[PDB]
DNA sequence: CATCAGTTCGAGTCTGGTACTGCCCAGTAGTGATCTTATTTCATTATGGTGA
């Protein structure tokens, strides 16, 4: 899923990419890595991942190879 | 002798000792209504440091 918005990183971002994911494809990941953003340390994204049963994985700060691909 | 003092009789007046009558108010505890207040929640609002 690809999303484009003028705003800085904020949940809306996340609702969106995941909406399209669950829209044109069908479901959603199983383990979703996501750096140590704020959009990911928020309550909304974690609650949504819990609701849809996605294992949330977090790379350590300043390390980029963990999401290198 | 007839004047005044010591004696009587019965009525006037108070008072204790004993019993009794004709009459409605006052206080208290139920409810239902309508305020009233020392005290317990429902939102905004400011402060905080750091990884994308």
A38 touches strand B (CB under 7 A): yes
A55 touches strand B (CB under 7 A): no
Tokens 């829209």 sit at which residue?
Answer: A23
The integer distance in angstroms from the CA atom of A63 to the C1' atom of B15 is 126
Cα–Cα dist A68/A34, whole Å: 11
- The torsion of the CA quartet A7, A1, A49, A30, rounded to 10 degrees, works out to -150
Measure Cα distances from A41 to A26, A35, A47, A50, A60 in Å.
25, 9, 11, 13, 13
Residues whose CB falls within 8 Å of the CB of residue A6, separated by 6 or more in sequence, listed in order? none
Resolution (Å) of this entry: 3.7
Tokens of A28: 């959603």
Q: Alpha-carbon torsion A7, A48, A27, A19, what sign? A: negative
* Way the structure was solved: cryo-EM
């Amino acid at each position: 899923a690809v999303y484009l918005t003028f705003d800085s990183p904020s949940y809306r971002s996340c609702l969106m990419v995941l909406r399209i994911c669950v829209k044109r494809h069908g479901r959603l990941p199983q383990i979703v890595v996501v750096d140590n953003g704020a959009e990911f340390h928020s309550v909304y994204f974690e609650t949504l991942l819990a609701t849809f049963e996605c294992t949330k994985k977090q790379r350590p700060p300043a390390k980029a190879r963990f999401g290198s691909v």
